[PDB]
Symmetry: C4
Subunit: 388 residues, 4 copies
């Protein structure tokens, strides 16, 4: 119809309610479920769907052997109905590649997939299910993007890309697309020192992205974008409640404009909702591995270097496997505010469970409630022994 505008603010988050869960690995033990990873959720004006990068094989298939690998010619961004598992028969391919993002601008959807060898990758930007623009690697070192939805405002949909080292300075760019065409791009600015896999959301004409500093930071870098002026800033979440993984133990004071030290060259895609006292941070419970997942209300986390939790909610027990997490919202819902949502990737198989030769995941997703709801934990639920 008309382009969507981020006219609302976030609803007050007093707890999180279950939104979707596909139990993909449980079901796929005996049905034609595709092996995936790097999942996310994204809404169209009339439907919300699950998204992920297929590995081009079913979990029970012999080709599932080796799916711990990230980039192959057999991967593709697929989407499927909310809470259903990604099956061979219900998965819709959005584009071919091993790194992606996708978002609806109110009129139609833009999907981006990057493919190619490490030194010669390229992004293809699809709009209205047709390829429109292509961007060649600029640093010749794994051109890569968000792995979760982008956000649009009056037709302008910013996307964060990184090309270059994962263990030193890299070349991050913010591209501003409209109808799949490049309006402008700019190099990363601000104090964030390394950027990977940004998780974004929008409210009141501003887009906030919480990313991953793979090089040095255990606190997460934050990029705030003005989609009208097509400009941005960057910094780190100030709070001493560290949210990357692996990470050192939480200190009493964090860092606002530099990576909090202790862990180098590693991390995990994550997210946050930074809205004054209505601020909630997601993180794995373990400081060593992708185990467990919790949401912590940390008032003013972005700007207060001593901010600590005032409330929380466990999503996945520390005795269960988690993984990537990111933000999304249904910008086309009723009401006066945008309801914050997120998903957690529940990785099964390698490297943590190496009795099987594959790596896959299932999805759990939650949205905020203004009520203070009781909590439950949401594990993947599959028994690896069954796959032996």
């Amino acid at each position: 119809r008309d382009f969507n505008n981020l006219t609302k603010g976030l609803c007050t988050i007093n707890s999180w309610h279950i939104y979707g869960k596909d139990n993909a690995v449980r079901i796929g033990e005996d049905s034609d479920v595709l092996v995936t990873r790097e999942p996310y959720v994204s809404c169209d004006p009339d439907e919300c769907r699950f998204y992920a990068l297929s590995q081009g094989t079913t979990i029970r298939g012999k080709h599932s052997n080796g799916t711990i690998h990230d980039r192959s010619q057999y991967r593709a961004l697929i989407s499927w109905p909310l809470s259903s598992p990604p099956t061979v028969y219900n998965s819709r391919v959005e584009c071919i590649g091993w790194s992606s993002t996708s978002c609806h601008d109110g009129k139609t959807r833009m999907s981006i997939c990057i493919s190619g060898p490490n030194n010669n990758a390229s992004a293809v930007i699809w709009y209205n299910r047709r390829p429109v623009t292509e961007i060649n690697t600029w640093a010749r070192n794994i051109l890569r993007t968000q792995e979760s939805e982008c956000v649009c405002h009056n037709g302008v949909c910013p996307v964060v890309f990184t090309d270059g080292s994962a263990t030193g300075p890299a070349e991050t760019r913010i591209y501003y697309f409209k109808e799949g065409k490049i309006l402008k791009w700019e190099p990363l600015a601000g104090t964030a020192k390394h950027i990977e896999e940004c998780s974004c959301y929008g409210e009141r004409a501003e887009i906030t992205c919480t990313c991953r500093d793979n090089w040095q930071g255990s606190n997460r870098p934050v990029i705030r974008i003005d989609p009208v002026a097509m400009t941005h800033t960057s910094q780190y979440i100030c709070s001493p409640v560290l949210t990357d993984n692996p990470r050192p133990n939480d200190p009493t004071v964090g860092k606002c404009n530099d990576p909090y030290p202790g862990n180098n060259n590693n991390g995990v895609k994550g997210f946050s909702y930074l809205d004054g006292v209505n601020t909630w941070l997601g993180r794995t419970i373990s400081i060593a591995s992708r185990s467990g997942y919790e949401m912590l209300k940390v008032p003013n986390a972005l700007t207060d270097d001593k901010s600590k939790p005032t409330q929380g909610q466990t999503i996945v027990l520390n005795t269960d496997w988690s993984g990537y997490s990111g933000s999304f919202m249904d910008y086309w819902a009723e009401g006066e505010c945008y309801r914050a949502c997120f998903y957690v990737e529940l990785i099964r198989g390698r490297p943590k469970e190496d009795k099987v030769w594959w790596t896959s995941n299932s999805i759990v997703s939650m949205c905020s409630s203004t009520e203070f709801l009781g909590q439950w934990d949401w594990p993947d639920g599959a028994k690896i022994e069954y796959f032996l």
Copy 2:
């Protein structure tokens, strides 16, 4: 379009004709059919579908082991095309949880799923396929609801919930929703002493629910709701033709305002159509187990404590397994009256058939005819031996 109003009365029920049957267990012996239980049927203005609580695994899958359990994080309310089986590929998830209800108000559908641990469950009310309202447990003891469709009148859709003991007084509430929002709720009133799993239908601006008194009654409690005044009353079916299970043998006089004694702390979801002489009661044939199913015309059953059958129809032989049963009607059909319909859950597996490690069911459904049709019996049809 416009909200549906219960403007018609029930058609005269002279017999029951076959409406739908999915043969799910037979088919699922060699196809990707999801394990389910607590099924029902519900219509939209342009389509009627089967509904149930999936267990998040196929019947042949190794994860089917243990599906006798009621509440897990792997359950979800799913719907699928009438008379097709609930497969991985055709089942649409309405919401996540282990207790549910759903109904269309003429404009769109409201679905409710409750999830969480026993002492911290919560209901999430979805409208137009989006989460709108959440309600936290008030008694911290398995918040639970109907397990069959709710009914709407001019946008108001009442739903009966119970939180608390299953073997003593509990806290039952009647919530009046409109567009997924709470207009009002009220505590159960009247003489019904315990309420669980209400089966409802509407006619001439009144909604009648036949429920399960798990604590003490072998006769069934009845809640009648005025969706305009948003008020209700409750009592028990007076008739000595007892319809819960297990239950004592039928006496010559029943009880109108108290549970008929003889069996405690157990029961089965059931239903009835209470319309003067046009009154029909459903029940298992066995007084000891969920075996067989029959419909009995018992004129004035609700108000006459000595009422006995004047006609009947066998639905499932006593030599076949039955289970839950509930009411639904196609409020959008042509004609001058609403045609009464019902479904019977045909449970297979545990605990009655323990050679297999799973518990599931198939569905059979019938609607009324003004003709006096010949009768057939409708068993699940699967051979457990095939699953060994």
Copy 3:
């Protein structure tokens, strides 16, 4: 939109071209294909689909054992996309039962399914996918109907039913439905002595049905219906080219008003297009079994007792299994005439191939061409050995 009227005459049939083929048994050897029998084809104004009576199990499933049986509670009329096989995941249930017919009147579709025990069967007439009318058995001996599509004219859709003996006089009725309601019914009249499984088509406001005289005739009875006056006549195809099966060898002169003798109490559903010199008869090649299938142009077959073939086309070799056959046409196609079409059921399994415990079929369908096209044979194509 508006009710369809049979305003066109038949196109000139100079040969038959391939229209559809599902290769169901071949494909189902390794996919979730439902066991079926009694198939047919029927068009809606915007789509033509395959129809059949499912047996409520896949072919590879253990429940396929015993599917030679005709009437069980696990059967249902299903439809699916043209030339695709009837799978668990793409088959749409139209109604429950073991005998059926279905047709579109231009506005919506009417489907009829009969179910029940031999002495207490009933038909349920569905219109716009909702049950509207029910008819109880009148002779208490396997109420049964066409097993191929009915035909409508200005909303009136006649259907032929038989109740009673299959080996002596029975009670055949012609019901005239409009919007699923009974306008009128009448007992069979004319000289046809026994009627079963009528195959019908319409042209120029007249509906012609070629049926099966199971009791005594090897020539086929013909019922011609006037859907406006709602009246009919009946006789037999006069031609000595006999078309039932089993049957005696072809004589030089046939019978116009009595069954041609030689074979009793058996037969097969079949069809014909009776249009003066543009007359074509279908039949099995074998006079003893459901083997092979050919189309023969027999000018004036209906009225000329000495009529013999002037042209022909082999459809299935005598070395391949055939079965039921019936007529259908796309009444919503472009052009000035209706193109005659037919399907042949290719039965596999029991009783002819008893190394397997099941009975099923695939479908082949053809339509007429005004060209004189080269011919090919169209067998089922599956290797029974693969199923052992």
Copy 4:
């Protein structure tokens, strides 16, 4: 809506970007994927889909044995969603046969399938999913057509057919269809000596087809059609960069009006985009077998007998199997030019991999970019060993 007119010219091809890939053989190792061959891609105004000739069996099915054979009664033209694999459950049958073409004219789609024995084949032309016209074999020797999409201009859709010898002069005809009806046909004219499997595209009211001279040429014949005058010309690509397979090594000067000698009675379906300096040729890397695939920019290839490459892009490594290739474009995309696209059939199984008894393929497809994108290779990806 309105008939599409070829009003645009080709976009400048500076490189090729990944468009679609189904990984059919990898996925089908453990899912119900149909065996196919002779694939292509074709767009409708609102969707682009994959097309191919099914063999009427799954790859894992026992009936996959023998699928190296080209013409059987179990083949059909099927289409399915872009980049999904051709499964039993998502494949839509367009028509029955073993040779085909299909194209959308802007209003609806025309599909053509040829079937029958070698000496009595016939084509059936479908329009708006209904059979409209039939054409009988004129040379009684494998009537056959394009195996890739046709192209339309103002309702007129030319199609190239060949009937007769594959190793000597044959009878090629160009048929001009409109709404599935024959407007005109004409015998092949010009200097092309043998024509098979034309790959076509349109721009600025002209349709260009690059075909296969199976008899003598290793250079490819080219037919250029004027769809308004309904006339055509034919010649060969002049360039010494030979593009059929098998073929002799590249010479320094080619042949414009005669087959370049060296290899007889064999070839492979292929394609090219002939647009002055914006000319790109596709070909297998191997001169001996269907191994590898590359795109070569050969300015003025059509008219310059000494033209050599100025740029190139590898699509499939010479160490991987390729096969048929053809052209298609999305004539309904936005922008001022038509973006050239192509697909490559990746054949797996027999005859090159005879450890398995089947022959099938997967699909990879690319479209042009005005950027100079980095290149990757795109193999089928399946491990034959897994199928043993």
